[PDB]
Amino acid sequence: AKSDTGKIGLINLGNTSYVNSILQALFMASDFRHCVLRLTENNSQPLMTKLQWLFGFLEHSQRPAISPENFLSASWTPWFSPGTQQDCSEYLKYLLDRLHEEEKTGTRICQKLKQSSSSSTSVEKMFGGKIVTRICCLCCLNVSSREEAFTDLSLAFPPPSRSVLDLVNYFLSPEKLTAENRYYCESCASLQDAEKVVELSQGPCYLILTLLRFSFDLRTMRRRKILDDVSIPLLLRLPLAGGRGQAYDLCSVVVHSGVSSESGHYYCYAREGAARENQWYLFNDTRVSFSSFESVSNVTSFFPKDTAYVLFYRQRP
């Protein structure tokens, strides 16, 4: 349509940029877009079916921008009040959870009905990873492991790290469980000092990173946005279990623009998210323009109120 980029914008329906920026980031995550667009006509995935309809318009509309109203309503986060500004990572997590559960439930019912008469979802394939936590009791040396799935890594800022790799290393750093946080060891049947180790047992196809850009101010008893610039690499080496590493290519960056955590606006930078097409674009509701990784890198330096919040990376084949 009207943007010479060949891309279609999304109309803001009243404080809905938190939905638009996420939909564009998911649309640009090539392998996920393909999962969605190829969904067979006979399926038991009602929400993914609505997403396929929307992705069809983003692919073929002759209009400059379209309304995602039908999908926005079908995927509406039930604890959100329409017209109120919201967290885009909270919406993304809800959306991925809904798309995962409807497919998982459908597969399970189908299999159970066949077994009574006598696998992984698209979300798991595209965004699912696994993390293992190991706690070593320093008294008896027993190590208790626990593996859990994730669709994103919630990257905390260290107490009062300049790069994404610094934040990733901090997320995976070993920790001493001591004093008020001593570990209850059932082998020792007592509270004991322990060492906590965290490793990524399975790297996801698309790695979603949420930068935890908020602190809680104990003087005012209010949360505050963290505006600290964090450098974003085009190529990230994700540390994996056993000292291994996996290369990841930056796909998209969702930016929150605003001095505070109570209000603001979201926009997205993205290039094609297929396995490594190199063109960057800037998606800001109805307006899509050509952009660059230089602009992704310049964000917080040029506009101190604008900060990357959600990042998408794709595993290098």
């Binding site: 803001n12 009243g14 404080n15 809905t16 940029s17 938190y18 604890w79 109120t84 500004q85 919201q86 967290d87 885009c88 990572s89 909270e90 997590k93 809800y94 991925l96 959870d97 699912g128 936590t133 706690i135 208790s144 626990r146 859990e148 799935a149 994730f150 994103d152 919630s154 990257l155 905390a156 800022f157 260290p158 107490p159 901090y170 997320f171 920790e175 469980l177 008020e180 946080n181 570990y183 209850y184 906590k196 949420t210 935890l212 850009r213 908020f214 602190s215 809680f216 104990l218 008893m221 949360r223 946005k225 929150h256 623009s257 605003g258 955590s261 209000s263 603001g264 606006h265 919040y309």
Partner: protein
């Protein structure tokens, strides 16, 4: 049972809870330790955001399960 909570600064804190504790009860226990009011809190377990009204048992949360504490950046 002893669970772990990853705080906003990435520190792991321990929490003593019961399988029957509601997500609201866990948010109150986090407020007691961190000072963060429950209406600010979002709790993530194995990628899922925990819903108010549900219990830890509904999510198969047990000893050594890790909950991740996150707040909100609102935008429109």
């Amino acid at each position: 049972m002893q669970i772990f909570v990853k705080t906003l600064t990435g520190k792991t804190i321990t929490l003593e809870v019961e399988p029957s504790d509601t997500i609201e009860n866990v948010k109150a226990k986090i407020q007691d330790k961190e000072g963060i009011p429950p209406d600010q809190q979002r709790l993530i377990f194995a990628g899922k955001q925990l819903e108010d009204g549900r219990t830890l048992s509904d999510y198969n949360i047990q000893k050594e399960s890790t909950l991740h504490l996150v707040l909100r950046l609102r935008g429109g």
